[PDB]
Amino acid sequence: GSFTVKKVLNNNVLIASHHKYSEVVLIGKGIGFGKKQDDVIEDKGYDKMFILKDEKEQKQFKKLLDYVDEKLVDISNDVIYHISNRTNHSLNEHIHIALTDHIAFAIKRQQQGFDMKNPFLMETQSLYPEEYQIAKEVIDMINEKAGLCLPEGEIGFIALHIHSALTN
Secondary structure, three states: OOEEEEEEOOOEEEEOOOOOHHHEEEEOOOOOOOOOOOOOOEOOOOOOOOOOOHHHHHHHHHHOOOOEEEEEHHHHHHHHHHHHHHHOOOOOOOHHHHHHHHHHHHHHHOOOOOOOOOOOOOHHHOOHHHHHHHHHHHHHHHHHHHOOOOOOOOHHHHHHHHHHHHHH
C-alpha cells in the first residue's frame, strides 16, 4: 500500500513506516532519490520494488550497505527481479542479503584478477537445470551492468543461491 519515509539510506534503499506502524526496508530503482523523512510513497510498479519485513533481514541488509554501493545494490536488485519473474515464485527475503553480498564479492574478485574454478558445474546443472539456466542469464546481466566477464564457475554459485531462495 502506502509507505512513509523514516530515513533514506541511499538512492535505491529506504527505511519506511507501513502496516500497523511496522518498520520495513524498501529496495527499488531510484526509490530514495530526492526523498526525505515523511514523504509518502506508493509502489510505482515499474521500479522493481522489494520489501524486507523481517527485523533480522533488515538489520543484515543495512549492515551490508556499510560497504556495498548503491550501484551494486541496483545490479543485484535487477538480477533478483529477473530471478523472481523467471521462477514465477516467492523468493525468501534473505536472497537480498546473501545474493547482493555474493554478487559484490564476485565482481570485486574479478576486478582484482583473482581467478576462480568451480569443479562441480556439471553436477550443479544436472541437479538444478532450471536454476542453472536462470543463473547463466543472471551472469550475462551482471557482465553487461558491471562491464566485465565473470568466471564460468559463478553460474554454479548463483544456481545454488536460487535453490535456497526458492526453498528457505
